[PDB]
């Protein structure tokens, strides 16, 4: 659903969002990707929630828990970080998603590149503390604060994903509460109590008629309905898979910052610089689940959604191969010179090398004559707080402050959906314009309902299948995703000999590690991924493997490798959970055969 907005009219000069200051300022307001001030959707959710809590607390006759506080936990979701002891029910998510309130899009466009104007949206407010006995300024207590000019009208998209079974009375209760709590909101941001941050907050379509209905009807209102997951339903009716494999490239563009948890540790979440395919499995279930049993296809291995990696050279950027080593003083891909493929080049005299460890390399043909283009993913740290509601300030009891790294807006990523011909027949027999249904705007990630996670997904045309070369002398492997082999005991503690045995069995070729002493043959790193499963309400198990970028090359001792099979393994991936994008291999790639030490970068 879409169409609701919150309109925020700032009626006094306002300050929000940041515990940092610029050169002449000791407190700087928060600024969007356009460097313009905005109200973050977590601030806006938190402010609007608080005002609904006031309304409910009044309708409850001041009871801290009761019928109408239940309705707040319905609309805005439970707060499981507060509750303690054996709370048995699973925490409800919010029914309301509230974006960040940004300045008018046309006004924002007027500012672009006008750095001097962006600074003029805000000004120094002086601040001094006076000594009560002397009547003079205290020492130390002199501050200068950035404040944003009053008159700003900001608007946030809002989504109300109300349950399908919710009655018309309960719909009008939600509208009444939200319209009430919006009208009760008179301040937001920092120093609200000392003038700042006065506002009008309006929903589109929630007039006082919605408050008047609640006034006439609040005594008739029951408890909110019980929450339940949208469970999955499997038809089981899919065809068997049949070659060929179609490849449907999905461009993902970040429209707000996206938090893709790498390490969730204490009060900080660190972010991946790629979108795992598991984030897109929900969008695949939505758009395609009417055409075939997506859950059966996932179970059968008839479906892959790769990771969305940064777009380079118009294609998916490939995880920098760990066989590349830079000159420790004056080389590497960020310098654009002095990169050696240690699978093929000796270490130079005197200069010691360091491995490349991250980023993404672009395309590279067997005679590129240039270093591959390097894509970098921009990410920013966002900092938030939790307010303890009786003191109205953060406290240790509520955890104080937390941070998310996020992939910022404007980044462009390419995933690929791969499907067998039998499913593409199935779909096309039901919709000939089915790739048009893959155009969507969706929320993915951590915190996806408020400030984070908005992405556009657009399909390209069907891409070409990979074309690995079936070299009979050597075979190389480049990891473009994280490979999750299981050991022979089904735990994930596999070893490179397990990968050798795996590829040997799959390709029916014997392999031996190449012995050229100046050249490295294996350049792996391990990876451990910790993730939650939303359908389980429990963390996934822990998935251990090797990082994207890991590389190795083998001398082919006997047998002949089939480029038809190399291609098949370059589509389906190897190992566990290839449907999510793990297991994505590159076989006999130029960039692993090439010698690079002589090359350089290009209103």
């Amino acid at each position: 659903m879409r169409g609701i907005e919150i309109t925020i009219t700032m009626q006094s000069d306002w300050h929000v969002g940041t515990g940092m200051g610029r050169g002449e300022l000791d407190s700087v307001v928060q600024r969007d990707g356009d460097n313009l001030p905005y109200i973050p959707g977590k601030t806006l959710t938190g402010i609007l929630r608080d005002s609904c809590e006031q309304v409910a607390l009044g309708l409850d006759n001041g009871q801290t828990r009761g019928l109408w506080h239940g309705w707040i936990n319905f609309i805005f979701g439970d707060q499981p970080a507060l509750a303690q002891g054996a709370i048995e029910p699973e925490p409800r998510p919010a029914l309301i998603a509230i974006g960040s309130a940004h300045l008018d899009p046309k006004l924002k466009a007027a500012f672009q590149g006008k750095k001097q104007l962006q600074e003029a949206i805000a000004f120094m407010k002086p601040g001094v503390a006076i000594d009560a006995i002397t009547g003079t300024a205290k020492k130390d207590f002199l501050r200068f604060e950035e404040v944003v000019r009053l008159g700003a009208k900001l608007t946030a998209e809002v989504e109300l994903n109300l349950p399908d079974n919710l009655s018309e009375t309960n719909k009008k209760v939600i509208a009444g509460i939200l319209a009430s709590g919006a009208k009760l909101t008179e301040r937001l941001g920092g120093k609200r109590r000392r003038g700042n941050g006065r506002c009008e907050l309006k929903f589109s379509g929630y007039s006082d008629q919605q408050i008047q209905w609640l006034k006439d009807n609040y005594q008739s209102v029951d408890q909110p309905p019980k929450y339940q997951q949208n469970k999955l339903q499997s038809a089981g009716d899919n065809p068997e898979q049949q070659p060929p494999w179609h490849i449907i490239p999905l461009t993902i563009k970040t429209l707000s910052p996206v938090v893709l948890p790498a390490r969730t540790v204490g009060n900080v979440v660190e972010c991946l610089d790629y979108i795992p395919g598991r984030y897109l499995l929900g969008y695949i279930h939505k758009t395609l689940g009417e055409y075939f049993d997506v859950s059966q296809a996932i179970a059968a291995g008839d479906l892959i959604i790769t990771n969305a990696t940064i777009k380079i050279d118009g294609k998916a950027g490939r995880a920098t191969p760990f066989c590349l080593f830079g000159e420790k003083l004056d080389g590497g891909l960020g310098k654009g010179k002095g990169v050696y493929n240690r699978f093929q080049e000796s270490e130079p005299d005197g200069i010691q090398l360091k491995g490349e460890r991250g980023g993404y390399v672009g395309q590279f043909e067997q005679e590129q004559r240039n270093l591959p283009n390097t894509g970098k993913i921009n990410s920013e740290l966002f900092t938030h707080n939790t307010i303890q509601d009786d003191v109205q300030r953060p406290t240790s009891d509520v955890g104080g402050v937390y941070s998310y790294e996020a992939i910022i807006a404007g980044q462009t990523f390419v995933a690929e959906l791969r499907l067998p011909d039998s499913l593409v027949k199935q779909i096309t027999s039901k919709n000939k314009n089915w790739q048009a249904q893959l155009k969507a705007t969706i929320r993915i990630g951590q915190s996806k309902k408020d400030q984070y996670g908005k992405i556009e997904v657009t399909s390209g045309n069907s891409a070409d299948l990979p074309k690995p070369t079936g070299n009979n002398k050597t075979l190389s492997i480049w990891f473009l995703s994280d490979i999750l082999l299981r050991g022979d005991r089904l735990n994930f503690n596999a070893t490179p000999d397990d990968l050798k045995k795996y590829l040997e069995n799959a390709l029916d070729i014997k392999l031996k590690e190449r012995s050229d002493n100046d050249l490295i043959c294996i350049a792996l790193r391990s990876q451990r991924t910790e993730s939650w499963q939303v359908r389980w309400g429990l963390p996934r198990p822990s998935l251990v493997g090797w990082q994207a970028g890991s590389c190795l090359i083998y001398d082919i001792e006997s047998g002949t490798v089939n480029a038809e099979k190399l291609q098949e393994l370059m589509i389906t991936g190897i190992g566990d959970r290839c449907t999510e994008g793990y297991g994505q291999i590159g076989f006999n790639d130029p960039l692993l055969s090439a010698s690079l030490g002589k090359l350089t970068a290009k209103n």
């Binding site: 509750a83 048995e88 022979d488 089904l490 503690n493 070893t495």
Partner: protein
């Protein structure tokens, strides 16, 4: 000291557990399915009270399972259309049909624990606001200050010919209250 491990391939979970039933007596088990991670107990004969309908794969069925008791652990994971690999791990050499025996030497087994989710709310319930409730197959009741742990043993062995040790496996044992 030997860690004995028994492999069978292209075997359904329903059949894998039934093949191991003599050893998986009273065994707690964890079943991974697309929509649930359910904990189950096998009875004293090693049987599940709805084993076919629980362990089938066909419709959002179990793709991976673990079963463990004091003496052994069975692991299973799907590989094609509900057939999978079974591996049973045991401290003792034991007789199984169709399974292939192997072993690995280990230097020492070290016990570990794993605190489960929740405070106390046969079967007992833990609950935590973070996740809601968690039901655990545990026969003794739980006092409000009890916490339920899961115990395991990790087996250290030499990996490299240079003698580098690592934990080559970790077998699960039982639920335990601390």
């Amino acid at each position: 000291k030997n860690l004995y491990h028994y492999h069978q391939y292209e075997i359904t979970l329903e059949s894998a557990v039934d093949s191991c039933k003599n050893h998986l007596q009273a065994a707690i088990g964890l079943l991974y399915s697309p929509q649930k991670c359910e904990l189950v107990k096998l009875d004293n004969s090693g049987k599940l009270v709805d084993s076919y309908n629980r362990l089938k794969f066909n419709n959002l069925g179990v793709f991976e399972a673990r079963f463990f008791n004091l003496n052994c652990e069975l692991r299973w994971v799907n590989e094609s259309n509900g057939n999978g690999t079974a591996v049973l791990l045991s401290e003792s050499d034991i007789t199984l049909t169709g399974f292939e025996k192997g072993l690995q030497e280990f230097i020492t087994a070290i016990d570990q624990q794993y605190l489960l989710w929740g405070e106390p709310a046969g079967w007992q319930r833990l609950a935590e606001a973070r996740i809601g409730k968690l039901d655990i197959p545990l026969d003794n009741p739980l006092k409000p200050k009890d916490r339920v742990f899961l115990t395991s043993e990790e087996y250290i062995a030499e990996v490299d010919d240079f003698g580098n040790c690592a934990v080559i496996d970790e077998r699960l044992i039982k639920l335990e209250v601390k």
